Write a protein that binds this DNA or RNA. Structure first.
Lengths: 53, 177, 86, 60, 122, 113, 138
RNA sequence: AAUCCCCCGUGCCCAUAGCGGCGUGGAACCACCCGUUCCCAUUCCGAACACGGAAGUGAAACGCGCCAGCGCCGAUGGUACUGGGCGGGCGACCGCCUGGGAGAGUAGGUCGGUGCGGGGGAU
RNA sequence: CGCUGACUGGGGCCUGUAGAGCACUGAUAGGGCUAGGGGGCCCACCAGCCUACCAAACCCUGUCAAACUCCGAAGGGUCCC
RNA sequence: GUCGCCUCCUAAAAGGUAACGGAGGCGCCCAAAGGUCCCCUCAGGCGGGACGGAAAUCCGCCGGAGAGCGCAAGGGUAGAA
């Protein structure tokens, strides 16, 4: 998107490998290297999910 | 005094020499009668300031007359009045005037004057029991003084359908005090 | 290379609110009443409003849709006599 | 069955849209002509609105 | 009915609060109903401009508890006069108040028919 | 405010929450002195005195049991009617240990909740 | 009836600049007054004035009361020339709704004030109506 | 057990039920109440939420009644505005003919009306 | 395709200018009650005192609003008959 | 000068319309204003007391919510967002 080194930075998150990812917008603003949550890659379902990229 | 009509004809009526005016009374009404010529005379006297009544079929010779109306129109010539009597001993809604004299205090010496947002006095003394002309003027006037409700000074019939402290009549600088 | 002031001059753009389907017509599982999108429809007609009473839409199917406050979200069912046994 | 008998007057030339329809409706071809109908508030209405349109007569 | 108006406790606070950490801990030991509220404003009448800080201390204490306090705390205060305010209630000292409790007090608590507490009962 | 926005305490709307649907308003009206619930179901529905502390006297087992039974039974009375799966009605306060009690009733009452 | 841009974006929230209401003196009955019939964004200024000159010629007792007051205004030449016209304000008043209760020469027997107002009408602008009130003028 | 009086859960009509002034009720009802080990529980205390239980009380919330002062409701006859038709004035505008016809303004009206169930109260 | 169409009669459901209205809001005038500034007086840390000048807010008499409206029509709409 | 887009007014009352006609906001953001389950009852005014004399902090009364909601308006609306 409109890449603006302004606390506005786009990122994703793997599925422990579940394989690929899924969309997400972000803001250093707070918690830098902070970013985790679960989902479900083509890999079965669910799976921890770090976001960092 | 007299005034007739009551069918169902306001336009033409509301025209010529006869002005509408409902026959209003606690419990019943009856087509508008009267006339644009009587209103005159009488009204001219002092509508809701004294009271009388007219003989339509000797029907019911009672008082109460007007409790509403208007010379509305621009021209300033009324048309479409309200009429309500009172053959009861409940007479409240009674709004009769009150006059001073000229007592010299701020005027004939201080030139000063006085506003009278009052004049009238909607109260409720002894039903069918009021002096068409009640006067009360303890005098006093000038500087930054003022008198209103509260003080006042009511005779006989102890009503006051009104309140205390409020638009009585004060003395202001017709020029400067 | 900028813009100016003291020229307020600031036209406004377009909207498109409505009551679509108004009150009491052939009811179709589709946009009920509208004046606040993202809306959250309801059940049958609506009668709640900053007015007092209520409004029936002698039209019944799945559901309709609200407008956020205005109108008055549905809930006071009202399938309509035209919802009995065939 | 109050049967109504109206005639044609003051050409609707350029006059209100609808009004005209009420014309072709009630059944109004050429000018200053005469037609009749049943009271029927329907037909009635229309015509009336058309009022000034021409002239109504209670006939049969 | 003289068995009415005739009193029976009703609340009674006792607190303090400075444009600030712990001082309320000296508060906890004297009783047991910690007050945690946030004063504020935005000026320099003390250096208290900070309009959103936690300095307000208020150790609520009606009935039961207050009793132990009214008790062990009523001796060191020397006055008994004036400090008597209208609304059947009063406030002395480093910060303390207590309210009367005539029979027509509560009702003023209802969300409904909230009788604006008549002035002949209180 | 509108009648229900100047008083205080209730939540009726947290009743209408379940109103939407799910089943009978297995609404349980409490008053310590005892517990009383009905069964407001959608459509200007009604009820069937399914369980009350008086209906069968008020016993002498306090909270505990009371419920334990009032419910059960209740549940018994209804499933005779022809209900089945009824939605719960916290009527008021938080599913207090009472509440929870009655609750049991239903459940044990076999009237699914 | 072209009127202004808003009560706080263009020009709304003023004192309009004028010379207040009441003058003369009381009076319970005597109904002495003035009103109109003409429609016109009553010329503020012209207004303010007028009425005043009224006092200028009398002085004291005669309800020099007056029930008017402008509160909106026009605009015109300021900027380019004639085309896309922004707006420069000036001259507020109030609509004299085709006649109505003007100002009052109210008092017992004091025509020495009737003539006044009179002088007051003369002035004004939109013709004016010379009149009396409930009862007349004594 | 398929009638009225009462209280209790409680619903519809979004104040003709609100405010408040005086009053009445506790056999029954309901609350306040009596205590706090354990269920749960207060950012502070079992005030509120809460478990167990008599005595005490109707004070309080509360329920029925009376009171128009504040409010709420609100006609008839009536005036503005106007759909439609046609006239006057250069003029801002005025008027007529035909169906529609409010608010405010006096009368007065109101101190709810009515559902279902539960406890009784009427062999 | 064939009576569905402009239009009228009926029936619901809507919009809420004009008007009007003042409890929402913002004006605004005559005034009463009042505290803020006065102002003259004990010399005035007195924070005690009277009162004719300006006011805020509440109360009475009044009045303007397209970007105000507790109120509310003319009329237009839309589905059905 | 100005072009995009969000709101008011203009639109005459369904919807919708110029004007270089009125006024005002946006090319953000919030990882927790997210999802639910559980509790809360606003501004304000008045009356009484610490540090406090605008302007808190607590305690006791009054309240078609006038506060409340990251941002402009407008609708909403505590039952509550």
């Amino acid at each position: 998107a409109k890449d603006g080194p302004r606390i506005i930075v786009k990122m994703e998150s793997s599925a422990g490998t579940g394989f690929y990812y899924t969309t997400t917008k972000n803001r250093r603003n707070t918690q830098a290297k902070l970013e985790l949550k679960k989902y479900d890659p083509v890999a079965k379902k669910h799976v921890v999910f770090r976001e960092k990229k | 005094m007299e005034l007739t009509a009551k069918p169902r004809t306001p336009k033409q009526k509301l025209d010529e020499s006869m002005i509408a005016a409902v026959a209003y009374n606690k419990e019943n009404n009856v087509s508008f009668a009267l006339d644009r010529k009587a209103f005159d005379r009488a009204f001219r006297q002092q509508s809701t300031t004294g009271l009388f009544d007219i003989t339509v079929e000797g029907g019911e010779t009672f008082p109460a007359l007007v409790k509403a109306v208007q010379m509305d129109k621009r021209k300033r010539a009324p048309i479409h009045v309200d009429f309500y009597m009172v053959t009861y001993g409940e007479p409240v809604e009674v709004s009769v005037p009150v006059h001073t004299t000229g007592r010299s205090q701020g005027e004939v010496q201080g030139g000063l004057v006085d506003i009278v947002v009052h004049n009238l006095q909607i109260v409720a003394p002894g039903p069918r029991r009021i002096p068409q002309e009640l006067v009360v003027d303890v005098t006093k006037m000038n500087i930054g003084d003022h008198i209103t409700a509260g003080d006042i000074k009511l005779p006989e019939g102890c009503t006051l359908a009104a309140d205390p402290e409020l638009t009585v009549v004060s003395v202001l600088p017709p020029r400067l005090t | 290379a900028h813009k100016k002031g003291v020229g307020s001059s600031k036209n406004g753009r377009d909207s498109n609110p409505k009551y679509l389907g108004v009150k009491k017509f052939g009811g179709e599982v589709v946009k009920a009443g509208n004046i606040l999108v993202r809306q959250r429809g309801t059940k049958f007609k609506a009668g709640q409003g900053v007015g007092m009473g209520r409004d029936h839409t002698l039209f019944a199917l799945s559901d309709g849709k609200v407008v956020f406050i205005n109108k008055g979200k549905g809930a006071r069912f009202i399938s309509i006599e035209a919802a009995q046994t065939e | 069955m109050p049967r109504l008998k109206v005639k044609l007057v003051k050409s609707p030339i350029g006059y209100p849209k609808d009004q005209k329809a009420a014309l072709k409706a009630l059944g109004l071809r050429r000018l200053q002509q005469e037609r009749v109908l049943e009271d029927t508030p329907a037909i009635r209405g229309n015509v009336e609105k058309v009022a000034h349109l021409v002239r109504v007569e209670v006939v049969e | 009915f003289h068995e009415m108006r005739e009193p029976r406790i009703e609340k009674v606070v006792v607190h303090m609060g400075i444009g600030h950490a712990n001082a309320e801990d000296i508060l906890g030991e004297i009783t047991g109903q910690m007050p945690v509220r946030t004063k504020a404003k935005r000026t320099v009448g003390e250096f208290d401009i900070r309009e959103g800080d936690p300095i307000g201390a208020k150790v609520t204490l009606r009935d039961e508890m207050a009793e132990e306090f009214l008790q062990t705390a009523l001796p060191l205060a020397e006055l008994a006069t004036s400090q008597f305010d209208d609304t059947g209630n009063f406030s002395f000292g480093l910060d303390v108040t207590v309210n009367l409790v005539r029979p027509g007090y509560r009702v003023a608590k209802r969300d409904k028919a909230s009788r604006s507490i008549p002035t002949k009962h209180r | 405010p509108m009648r229900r926005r100047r008083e205080a305490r209730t939540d009726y709307h947290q009743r209408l929450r379940l109103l939407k649907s799910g089943k009978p308003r297995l609404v349980a009206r409490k008053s310590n002195k005892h517990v009383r619930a009905q069964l407001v179901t959608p459509n200007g529905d009604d009820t069937l005195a399914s369980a009350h502390s008086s209906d069968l006297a008020e016993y002498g087992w306090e909270p505990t049991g009371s419920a334990y039974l009032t419910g059960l039974l209740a549940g018994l009375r209804a499933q005779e009617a022809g209900v089945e799966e009824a939605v719960l009605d916290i009527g008021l306060n938080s599913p207090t240990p009472k509440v929870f009690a009655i609750q049991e009733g239903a459940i044990d009452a076999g009237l699914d909740i | 009836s072209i009127k202004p841009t808003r009560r706080e974006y263009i020009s709304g929230i003023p004192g309009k600049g004028i010379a207040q209401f009441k003058m003369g003196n009381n009076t319970y009955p005597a109904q002495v007054e003035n009103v109109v019939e003409k429609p016109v964004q009553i010329r503020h200024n012209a207004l303010e004035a007028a009425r005043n000159a009224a006092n200028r010629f009398v002085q004291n007792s005669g309800k020099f009361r007056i029930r008017k007051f402008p509160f909106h205004v026009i605009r015109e030449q300021d900027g380019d020339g004639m085309r896309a016209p922004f707006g420069k304000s000036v001259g507020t008043a109030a609509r004299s709704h085709g006649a109505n209760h003007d100002f009052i020469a109210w008092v017992n027997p004091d025509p020495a004030v009737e003539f006044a107002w009179r002088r007051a009408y003369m002035k004004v602008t939109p013709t004016v109506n010379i009149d009396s009130s409930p009862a007349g003028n004594a």
